[PDB]
């Protein structure tokens, strides 16, 4: 009867906390969908939903929820892997009648040719290792469907990616699958979506400079965006070389109307190709159409600024700032620092100025724009260039849609970059220690995937391929930072957390280099290596003037690189890891928990999710009841005012709002010394105020940060 | 009281001096009406001291202008004063003003920026004595005030803000741009221009004999193909043109419809509408510092979105339809209309008429239709759209294709910005065109009879000028340069047809106007065919000639199954074309001549006089020199004409004879407009931009009028619907 369902629910509870996960409580709300002819597939499916609503009661309910839906998926899919593959390949769309492969013949045929090792390498019990929300994320958009019905099991998906990346190298494929299925790391979404497929477009970020300050050039550049965007990529565009409003047009007598009309056109292009889907636009502050730039947005492009140190200096000295038209003052964006500073001052001295403002006016126009919209993003051209390993190639003109990537672009090169994230929580042992070795062992494996990808990647434009091939850059990032601290009982801004911060990143960086180093021993160092800071014997931390903790042996590594080089020009760029973190149940990237309580829509259902680390503490400390959940909510997810919760927990679970943005920044600076490119630093300000903000950029710029601010969050 | 003189000196106000000066330029003006002392009086009315003698000049000229109301010679007298003032303020030797323009240094920037091609200045200077003398600065005095004011605005080359060229100086430079070493030809062409027998289109008058001479203004493109790669090429392509100032038509019918699958990247197509937002946006953006015309075919699934659209910065594109015969035949017989996504039903626009229908039915029987409306539903959308915004334009695909000498390069996919141009375009080719207008009032004599011979002779000169422009023109994209040398087309047209009728004393819809119409256009096709045929004896026929309807002995009128009058001997002309072929694939293309017609004082191209009171606020010169000639016009009579929005039909002391001439376009059968339009259409190898004037338009009106013009065989059966 009622014991029928309840027992069946019992079946899937092994391992869970039985004082909180009570299964008869799921059956109460389910047994009332029992009509004469209720196909038990949908009883089952009801059960998953109910369990997920009780996630608010304990976090292992979420885990039960997943295990039920995964059961259904299992009953619904084929088990044997090569068989799911075959049917994917064989797909014929019945509307057109035309044979549509969904997987490349090249993979399928590697698969069948090595079918026995591969089919058996797969452990389907690992499918039961996501939570409900992580799992529905996959199901939604990651496991391939045939006619609405999902055909891929997550393991099928994982294994497809492994053979995408690794082709006929089997050991290597299986290895990338274990590390993957076991959850030590993950590639970004393009790789996941597209590895194995006929459009194997795997890279994520793309970044451009305007081909020319002419129409030919504008549109030439604009068609590239159009094209890139077709193969769903992040796009950055430096745009500062284009002449400003009122500037003469010699080939008509007309006047240029500036960027505002021009950026519309780009904007329309974002809106037109989607398969919201946005572009990042970069402006340097000496550009005449600066004020209107911080005015379009007060519209599906994101803005950021490529700031010279000079500008910052003038600002805090209450000095004047000059504004120029790039046609009237050329070569400005192909030079930085000392050299920029001289040139600029020299156009300035020749009265080659369009208009002059008190510097601080510009500064406060920006402050205003951030407070309204969170943008423009803040990047320090001088820091980025000064500390690039690609700097031997020219002046770096902008960055990507997210501000983690500092790579060179030109009339004939557009930068690419493929990403992976290591799951930083996975490395804390039960002995309450951080397994550093393992972290370097996974990095090597990851550096080799991103690296193999460069060679098998589908590029939307020749310019991309060309760049990537010449410089082989890779971007490794991390998720679950916040989660790793908590698991080690460390308050985020603790000094224990701060050392672990440094050390994690020494480690990742070390392993990265050491792989790349072995790869230069094999394939040879990349083309533009000779010239680079690292050939000269300088690593990231040297350019920051930092002497790393003795956790590893830098002295020796440097020698290894001295004999062979490195295959890849750059390796390290923490990115927002938006929804890959959501699948591995990790907080998103290098950031603290925004809220200890948040929500998830899953199709048509809404769910209240409490920080799981938090919830596991308070339930087991017998503190958690209805009125508590409500109390927290009323404090926008804070546990600080709740009278009856220990102060070490209060400490452990500060929201980001209650944590110091400065620290956040200092820590970013601390780990920054070990990061090739940059890191996507969102900032969160409480009761924000011009003094409280200004003071905040300057600290970042002073800290030596390539990227000062990504998005800024208000309340 | 005193005047400040040209030297800057004080001179006693002698005002009889002005009167005397007005008279001295009243040659063969009608003094029954023109009155030197009158102007002087109005000018002198409020006179303070120290007012300059340049100041009086303008005030004379601008005062004579406000008296056109009193009699039309005032327009001309007023012009004479103005031309004279200009003359006083500028170097009289042509080749010397030519140097000035070239040796020009920008003051605020420092840099030498020659204002004419050096090749032209060298060429000019090489033949100083000749060319300077060849010019007749007297012809300057022929323009009317407003026309003149026009040129001054935008055609006469300005030095540091001050006008340096004289109307003749401009003219001569134009003729040298066209002719180069060919000094013989350059004086002849100069003479024709200066004597106002024809003009070249603005681009030509603007840019000839200067650096990178963009001299034509017609560009049709086909969408490269159904891909992001294509769309954005064609787009860069349209930017490139707008930069160099084109007017653009765009064939767009091959873009996947809203929802069509995108095989490669999983999701769907957005549709035409989002994509047009891009074009509209580019059209907005690049504007030297005209617009776009977008052609769709009725079977396209995204047709309604298209129509919905303008039908209220959604607009800055003008919409036109490329209409298959089948559609009308469905529309009249109340049938069904299948809408198709071209990705799924490929090639619909690469085929026409008889072959189109066959193909469309093959798709239809197969079930490759995407929705299916009753045909009349569409019609009802097409006219609502027209009722609202006066677009879409109305072109008949298979009428454009069955009657095109370019028939051999394959289906023609669209027309140009203004619907006259019927040229082939493809991936590999953007079709350009160069234009001119024969001004048609010049060819009627004092003996009140039409001088067709002279017409045919001028046409010949123009053909040669047009052809030479192709070869020197500056192409913004290689494909245009590519299309033009292959097919070498040229687009001759006319202005002031209503002026030729009025002067012949023939009322627009009359039987004699009806016939003159046929004949004037017979004449032109004829003379053009000569020049072309002749250039072909000297230069070889054009490259894509063998296979042309004309290389089979088929002239335009033949595709129409019309027989020409016995004005010209056409059998003899064909013999001549059999022997030597022709240089240009197309010749005749009656186009809108907005500005160039306001210059010569002529009415716009082929459209009848649109009223008797234009605007300022003055009366139709032609009617006026008749009215007062018969001593019938008095003071308060402008008021009455205004009181009918320019209709002279109720005023009763005017007799029926004169009422019959001066019918404004709103009391004229549009049906008859179209009948003449087609009738002359038989000698136009390209199309003509027809505008339709319906006062208060209902469905029944527009419907019956589309079908009537269709049934005519028209190619453009409607440019703009002017409606008031
Ligand atoms: N004393 C005067 N009073 C009014 N108008 C004058 C006078 N002198 C010249 N003008 C007008 O100015 C214009 C010509 O410019 P300018 O100052 O050079 O005199 P002008 O044409 O050289 O010769 P003239 O003195 O013999 O008219 C003509 O419109 C002329 O009628
Ligand atoms: C044609 C055109 C250009 N522009 C802008 C786009 C570019 O930023 C800038 C340069 O135009 P260009 O394409 O370089 O114009 P040009 O080469 O003929 O003139 P120049 O000698 O000055 O190079 O002007 C407009 O804003 N509006 C326009 O209509
Ligand atoms: C990429 C993309 C194309 N389109 C349109 C433009 C074209 O009309 C059509 C095809 O674009 P294409 O660039 O040709 O698409 P594809 O080449 O990736 O795939 P396929 O070969 O099946 O075409 O889809 C969109 O509307 N939105 C988009 O985001
Ligand atoms: Mg005098
Ligand atoms: Mg395609």
């Amino acid at each position: 009867m009622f014991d029928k369902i309840t027992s069946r629910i019992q079946k899937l509870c092994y391992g869970l906390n039985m004082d909180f996960v009570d299964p008869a409580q799921i059956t109460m709300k389910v047994i009332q969908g029992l009509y004469s002819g209720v196909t038990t597939v949908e009883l089952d499916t009801l059960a998953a939903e109910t369990a997920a609503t009780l996630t608010t009661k304990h976090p292992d309910y979420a885990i039960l929820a997943a295990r039920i839906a995964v059961s259904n998926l299992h009953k619904e899919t084929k088990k044997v892997f090569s068989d799911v593959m075959e049917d994917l390949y064989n797909y014929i769309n019945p509307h057109n009648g035309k044979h549509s492969p969904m997987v490349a013949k090249s993979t399928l045929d590697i698969v069948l040719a090595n079918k026995d090792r591969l089919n058996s390498a797969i452990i389907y019990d690992r499918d039961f290792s996501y939570n409900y929300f992580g799992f529905k994320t996959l199901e939604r958009s990651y496991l391939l469907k045939i006619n609405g019905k999902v055909a891929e099991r997550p393991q099928h998906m994982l294994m497809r990616v492994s053979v995408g990346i690794h082709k006929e190298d089997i050991d290597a494929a299986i290895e990338t699958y274990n590390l993957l299925s076991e959850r030590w790391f993950t590639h970004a979404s393009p790789t996941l979506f597209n590895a194995g497929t006929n459009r194997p477009q795997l890279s994520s970020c793309f970044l451009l400079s305007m081909k020319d300050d002419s129409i030919e050039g504008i549109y030439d550049t604009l068609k590239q965006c159009a094209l890139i965007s077709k193969s769903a990529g992040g796009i950055g565009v430096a745009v500062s070389c284009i002449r400003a409003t009122g500037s003469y047009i010699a080939g008509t007598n007309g006047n240029s109307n500036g960027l505002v009309p021009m950026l519309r056109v780009y904007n329309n292009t974002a809106r037109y190709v989607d398969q919201p889907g946005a572009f990042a636009i970069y402006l340097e502050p000496w550009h005449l159409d600066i004020f209107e730039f911080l005015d379009l947005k007060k519209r599906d492009l994101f803005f950021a600024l490529w700031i010279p140190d000079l500008f910052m200096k003038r600002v805090e000295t209450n000095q004047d700032w000059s504004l120029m038209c790039p046609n009237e003052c050329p070569g400005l964006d192909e030079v930085w620092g000392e050299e920029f500073e001289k040139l600029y001052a020299s156009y300035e001295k020749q009265g080659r100025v369009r208009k002059v403002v008190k510097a601080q006016q510009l500064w406060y126009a920006i402050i205003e724009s951030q407070t309204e919209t969170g943008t423009p993003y803040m990047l320090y051209k001088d820091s980025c260039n000064r500390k690039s390993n690609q700097q031997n190639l020219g002046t770096i003109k902008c960055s990507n849609l997210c501000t983690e990537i500092v790579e060179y672009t030109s009339k004939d090169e557009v930068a690419v970059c493929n990403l992976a994230s290591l799951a930083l929580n996975m490395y804390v042992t039960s002995e309450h220690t951080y397994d550093f070795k393992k972290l370097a062992e996974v990095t090597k494996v990851v550096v080799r995937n991103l690296n193999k990808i460069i060679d098998i990647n589908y590029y939307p434009v020749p310019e991309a391929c060309l760049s990537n091939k010449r410089h082989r850059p890779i971007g490794i990032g991390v998720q679950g930072l916040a989660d790793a601290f908590i698991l080690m009982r460390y308050p985020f801004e603790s000094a224990e957390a701060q050392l672990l911060n440094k050390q994690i990143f020494e480690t990742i960086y070390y392993g990265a280099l050491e792989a790349s180093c072995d790869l230069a021993k094999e394939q040879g160092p990349y083309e533009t290596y000779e010239g680079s800071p690292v050939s000269k014997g300088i690593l990231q931390y040297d350019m920051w003037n930092v002497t790393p903790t003795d956790l590893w042996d830098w002295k020796v590594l440097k020698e290894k690189i001295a004999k062979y080089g490195i295959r890849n020009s750059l390796l390290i760029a923490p990115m927002p890891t938006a929804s890959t973190a959501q699948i591995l149940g990790n907080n998103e990237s290098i950031e603290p928990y925004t809220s200890n309580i948040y929500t998830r829509r899953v199709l048509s259902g809404e769910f209240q999710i409490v920080n799981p680390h938090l919830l596991k503490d308070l339930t087991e400390r017998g503190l958690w009841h209805e009125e508590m959940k409500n109390q927290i909510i009323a404090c926008n997810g804070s546990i600080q005012s709740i009278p009856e919760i220990p102060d070490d927990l209060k400490q452990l679970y500060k929201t980001v709002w209650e944590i110091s943005q400065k620290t956040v920044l200092k820590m970013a600076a601390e780990r920054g010394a070990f990061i090739d490119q940059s890191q996507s630093l969102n900032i969160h300000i409480a009761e924000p105020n011009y003094g409280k903000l200004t003071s905040m950029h300057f600290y970042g710029w002073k800290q030596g940060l390539k990227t000062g601010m990504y998005y800024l969050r208000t309340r």
Side-chain angles (χ1 to χ4, degrees), chain A residues 1-2 6-7 9-28 30 32-33 35-37 40-43 45-56 58-74 77-78 80-94 97 99-104 106-148 150-198 200-210 212-215 217-230 232-295 297 299-341 343-348 350-357 359-405 407-410 412-430 432-440 442-522 524-562 564-600 602-605 607-615 617-626 628-630 632-686 688-691 693-715:
Chain A
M1 191 202 60
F2 146 105
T6 332
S7 57
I9 317 306
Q10 188 91 274
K11 268 186 196 178
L12 300 145
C13 285
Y14 39 108
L16 313 171
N17 195 279
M18 290 325 292
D19 313 59
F20 302 110
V21 182
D22 163 37
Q25 261 190 195
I26 294 156
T27 319
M28 186 233 162
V30 142
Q32 43 202 184
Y35 60 80
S36 203
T40 103
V41 38
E42 327 145 309
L43 290 178
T45 221
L46 226 176
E49 262 144 17
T50 308
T53 319
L54 283 41
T55 283
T56 329
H58 182 286
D60 282 342
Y61 272 124
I63 291 171
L64 162 77
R67 313 228 275 232
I68 297 152
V70 180
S71 255
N72 282 61
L73 190 69
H74 285 167
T77 44
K78 299 195 179 174
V80 37
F81 166 68
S82 84
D83 281 336
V84 154
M85 282 300 137
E86 280 199 273
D87 301 351
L88 273 172
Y89 178 77
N90 285 347
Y91 179 75
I92 316 297
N93 143 64
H99 185 296
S100 291
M102 303 190 78
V103 301
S106 104
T107 308
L108 211 206
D109 286 75
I110 280 150
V111 166
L112 301 191
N114 290 147
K115 79 200 221 146
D116 302 3
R117 252 165 92 25
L118 273 153
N119 269 350
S120 48
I122 294 162
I123 292 181
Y124 297 112
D125 174 55
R126 294 167 172 170
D127 281 7
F128 288 120
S129 78
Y130 305 103
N131 75 104
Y132 190 74
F133 308 96
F135 177 78
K136 248 75 196 343
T137 299
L138 286 182
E139 194 166 291
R140 195 166 141 94
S141 23
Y142 286 93
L143 317 161
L144 284 155
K145 309 225 228 93
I146 287 157
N147 177 215
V150 157
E152 279 196 309
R153 295 179 174 200
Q155 303 319 295
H156 300 153
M157 188 276 273
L158 251 46
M159 185 54 85
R160 165 172 52 88
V161 185
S162 302
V163 274
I165 293 139
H166 284 296
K167 309 231 156 285
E168 219 206 70
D169 190 4
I170 304 312
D171 308 354
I174 269 139
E175 197 210 48
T176 296
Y177 157 78
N178 286 319
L179 280 78
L180 272 174
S181 50
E182 280 180 293
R183 291 177 329 108
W184 304 93
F185 96 105
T186 183
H187 294 275
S189 320
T191 302
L192 293 183
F193 291 141
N194 299 328
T197 90
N198 271 140
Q201 202 296 121
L202 313 167
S203 283
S204 334
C205 321
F206 277 106
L207 46 158
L208 295 87
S209 328
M210 205 80 105
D212 194 5
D213 172 32
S214 72
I215 295 284
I218 295 184
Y219 283 65
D220 264 319
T221 289
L222 174 79
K223 162 160 91 172
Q224 262 162 351
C225 292
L227 288 194
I228 276 158
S229 227
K230 185 159 97 95
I235 280 174
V237 216
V239 88
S240 326
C241 83
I242 299 317
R243 71 190 66 170
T245 300
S247 290
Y248 190 48
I249 305 297
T252 20
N253 265 46
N255 303 52
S256 176
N257 355 241
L259 300 204
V260 293
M262 187 224 91
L263 258 26
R264 287 195 71 167
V265 198
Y266 277 71
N267 176 67
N268 259 160
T269 292
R271 219 213 275 164
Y272 178 60
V273 8
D274 341 298
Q275 275 79 294
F279 300 165
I281 309 281
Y282 283 82
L283 229 207
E284 308 181 2
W286 43 261
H287 199 297
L288 186 76
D289 308 304
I290 182 58
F291 288 87
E292 325 55 28
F293 189 68
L294 333 307
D295 270 310
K297 217 123 215 128
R299 282 203 227 81
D300 167 16
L301 307 173
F302 299 126
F303 299 10
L305 307 158
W306 202 227
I307 307 160
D309 289 343
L310 206 271
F311 177 57
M312 304 305 298
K313 265 131 182 139
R314 296 274 195 85
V315 166
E316 85 202 343
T317 41
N318 203 2
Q319 302 275 309
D320 271 10
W321 177 256
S322 293
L323 297 176
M324 305 180 171
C325 166
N327 187 57
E328 195 215 37
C329 307
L332 215 30
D333 69 354
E334 32 249 315
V335 58
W336 63 269
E338 51 291 314
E339 303 206 23
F340 165 95
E341 261 142 36
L343 178 57
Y344 182 84
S346 162
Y347 284 141
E348 213 175 28
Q350 296 163 59
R352 305 265 291 275
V353 174
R354 211 59 65 81
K355 183 205 197 207
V356 54
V357 294
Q360 273 169 208
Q361 293 185 210
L362 210 198
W363 174 260
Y364 282 115
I366 300 171
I367 286 297
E368 186 39 31
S369 155
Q370 288 162 358
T371 58
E372 290 180 63
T373 64
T375 59
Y377 314 149
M378 296 285 278
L379 287 85
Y380 295 103
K381 164 174 151 289
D382 296 351
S383 277
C384 298
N385 279 285
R386 178 156 280 124
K387 280 185 284 205
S388 179
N389 186 46
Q390 269 181 21
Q391 89 177 63
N392 57 319
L393 294 186
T395 308
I396 286 146
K397 311 191 196 144
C398 67
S399 165
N400 82 305
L401 185 50
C402 302
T403 84
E404 76 270 35
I405 312 298
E407 336 211 312
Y408 169 72
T409 57
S410 83
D412 55 321
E413 280 166 272
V414 330
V416 177
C417 200
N418 351 271
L419 318 207
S421 40
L422 307 338
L424 284 185
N425 66 296
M426 290 298 318
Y427 296 95
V428 1
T429 79
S430 71
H432 291 285
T433 64
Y434 206 80
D435 179 333
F436 285 121
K437 275 143 51 59
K438 177 78 174 197
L439 171 61
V442 180
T443 300
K444 284 145 95 164
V445 171
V446 153
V447 172
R448 282 168 164 279
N449 290 26
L450 299 200
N451 195 249
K452 281 194 175 215
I453 270 158
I454 300 166
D455 281 314
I456 67 97
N457 192 70
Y458 171 94
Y459 300 83
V461 286
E463 285 86 334
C465 162
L466 193 251
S467 189
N468 228 16
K469 283 269 169 68
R470 280 205 196 151
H471 319 295
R472 342 195 85 260
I474 75 157
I476 312 173
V478 314
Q479 37 161 298
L481 206 247
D483 293 287
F485 291 170
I486 291 171
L487 290 173
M488 295 276 329
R489 293 293 115 190
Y490 301 148
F492 201 103
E493 60 214 325
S494 73
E496 292 92 335
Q498 275 171 25
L499 176 55
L500 194 66
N501 192 42
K502 305 196 194 80
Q503 278 169 334
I504 280 171
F505 290 101
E506 311 200 348
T507 313
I508 290 160
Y509 192 39
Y510 196 87
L513 281 170
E514 212 167 54
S516 204
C517 196
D518 304 302
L519 275 170
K521 193 206 189 219
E522 292 157 23
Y526 66 95
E527 208 188 63
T528 62
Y529 163 84
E530 227 53 72
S532 63
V534 295
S535 72
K536 278 162 171 164
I538 316 146
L539 293 181
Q540 190 56 171
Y541 57 76
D542 302 296
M543 283 149 135
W544 292 64
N545 283 84
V546 181
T547 294
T549 82
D550 68 15
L551 185 76
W552 310 90
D553 200 320
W554 298 99
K555 188 213 190 84
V556 150
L557 176 67
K558 265 185 175 156
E559 285 166 9
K560 198 168 153 90
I561 312 200
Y564 310 124
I566 51 171
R567 188 63 184 171
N568 311 259
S569 67
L570 298 155
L571 312 147
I572 314 287
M575 71 300 288
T577 57
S579 97
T580 47
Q582 218 269 2
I583 312 157
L584 312 168
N586 289 318
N587 195 52
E588 351 281 324
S589 153
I590 42 100
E591 73 200 30
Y593 275 95
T594 354
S595 206
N596 294 300
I597 202 171
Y598 33 95
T599 64
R600 301 296 162 67
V602 166
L603 293 161
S604 74
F607 303 101
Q608 264 166 3
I609 291 156
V610 17
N611 185 319
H613 300 291
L614 180 59
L615 186 54
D617 296 355
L618 302 157
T619 53
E620 87 186 357
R621 257 155 284 247
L623 284 153
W624 181 264
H625 29 70
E626 229 327 278
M628 180 108 99
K629 191 259 289 319
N630 290 344
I632 292 161
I633 290 179
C635 306
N636 305 262
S638 171
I639 57 150
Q640 316 300 308
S641 324
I642 315 277
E644 75 294 343
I645 313 179
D647 299 18
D648 57 10
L649 290 178
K650 268 181 192 142
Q651 208 69 286
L652 255 180
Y653 304 103
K654 292 206 170 177
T655 62
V656 69
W657 305 96
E658 295 154 352
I659 287 162
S660 164
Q661 300 315 275
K662 249 52 148 285
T663 321
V664 152
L665 255 35
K666 190 231 217 355
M667 301 192 40
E670 227 120 358
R671 67 166 85 84
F674 284 104
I675 313 194
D676 279 52
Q677 334 193 39
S678 218
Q679 74 217 261
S680 309
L681 252 182
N682 277 353
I683 285 310
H684 302 77
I685 294 230
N689 109 255
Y690 279 30
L693 228 171
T694 293
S695 137
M696 191 283 299
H697 294 286
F698 271 81
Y699 180 71
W701 165 63
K702 247 87 168 135
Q703 284 302 132
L705 295 158
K706 289 143 162 281
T707 300
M709 199 195 72
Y710 194 9
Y711 269 105
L712 168 262
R713 321 290 201 192
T714 303
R715 228 17 295 229

